[PDB]
Symmetry: C2
Subunit: 303 residues, 2 copies
Amino acid sequence: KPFTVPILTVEEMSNSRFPIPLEKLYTGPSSAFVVQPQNGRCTTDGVLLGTTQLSAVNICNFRGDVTRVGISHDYTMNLVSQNWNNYDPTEEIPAPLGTPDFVGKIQGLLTQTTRADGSTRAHKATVSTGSVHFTPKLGSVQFTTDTNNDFQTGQNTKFTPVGVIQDGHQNEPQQWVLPNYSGTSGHNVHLAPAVAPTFPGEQLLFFRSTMPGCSGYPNMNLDCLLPQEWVSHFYQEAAPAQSDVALLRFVNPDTGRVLFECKLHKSGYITVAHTGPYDLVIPPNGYFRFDSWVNQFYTLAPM
Amino acid sequence: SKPFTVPILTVEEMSNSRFPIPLEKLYTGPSSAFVVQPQNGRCTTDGVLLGTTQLSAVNICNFRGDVTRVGISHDYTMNLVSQNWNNYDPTEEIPAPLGTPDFVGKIQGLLTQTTRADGSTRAHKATVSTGSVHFTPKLGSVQFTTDTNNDFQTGQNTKFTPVGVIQDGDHHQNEPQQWVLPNYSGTSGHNVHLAPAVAPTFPGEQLLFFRSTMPGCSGYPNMNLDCLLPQEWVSHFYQEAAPAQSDVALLRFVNPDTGRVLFECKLHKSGYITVAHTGPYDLVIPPNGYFRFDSWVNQFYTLAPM
């Protein structure tokens, strides 16, 4: 089957690490730190990796029943799946699919329905993924909420993420630092691999969004390796990889001109020939086009 | 010419096209008491977007712009901008900005703001009532009720992220009203450039809906939300733009475990599905079931009964 990538523009696509649209393309050096996101990870022949699942609307969502911690404003959620069925901690994934893959404090609304009468309630809530109580691989996470009495036990409860917060500027979130999915009780397991360019003169190409900020002075940059729409495309097509590297051209259909070319690696990330940080300047109708399979030794034209 | 296909994603792997939440189930029911005229999740099979439909579920019922307090109240007017923060053009031939809510109800979420000069941020609970006379997205503004009367700054980028719906009053589940369109220009003018209403016409047929349950945030809301097409199907047809070789695409819903067909349905080229059933029914399906395009047929094709 012939390999292809979607023809959607950058602004028509969704971030694969948080439920927000893509905004722009960025490249920069990343030799000095580990790039190992767990969402937005898929091979070109459609194997999902890490905590990756198929729709952006599920990313950083949590579902379960909740119990108040003491008589505080904090609540423990005992996690269930997207469709309210069992989460199995022995499945060989790092954490439930869609679990946040960065250290930070995510604000949203915790909502609940009482099954017996259909009454509903919602409260502002924050989940700190750097907390010792962030233990989704064990099956639970803890929220700080704006109530100490309103949530009922044994009732379906959902967290919808909205944005990020900071305390003390732009020191958090840390988008390339993975949470400890088992807290202090164990090390992370079954991770999608860290990524790096292996070819001299190349850098990763990132698909960039700005997370909403909800308090303080947060770092709101969020970079993903693949748009969510590419994840879902590769998953469905499952086109065999004929080499380890697919050559893509970013084209302007208004002029037929190629703006730049890049390498899509079979294991699911893109590199460009550039040195230094750079915010790409792209036309509104630009899109990526697969042109050929190449080997690891192909030299890209400078971006 | 390019063969037509639908996605092989399962129902639970897909997203509602009318609110940013996952699909839960397939549902068919009678629609003669309603005008079914949603504006989101509208796309022809050859890839022409209709109504207010755009391409990602994460943008649906989101609003962006700058805000100004209404008097000394807890209400704020948002002067809308586009998704990428560029100016919104009210002269575009659409009913309202793409992604605008297409039902009458009260949507609760968080209104968030960044002050660009110093990177400071803030967020407050907020509700937009889409049946309000101040819901005028086609004119470029909507009004939010918030939990603050002083914290939002003027001239700063502000975003509403939707979460769920609320209800007020002794008549439980009386709102939202998912099949009642808002007045996108309020009292100023009638709605324009709408995607058309859809209805089954063939004897024994009903619409097939892709159904989600909206989170509820207060009161006793009706949380059912039905779309005509999953968001992934919209995106698929838009990209593929496979020509429609007849009025109707015959689909079979298949269990890939057994290869057995569970039911068949008619995907009309203007972008909605009918099935041969009468009455309310949650379809009984295996979780790995998916839709498969089998052949181009016509409006009068008589389906195997559900």
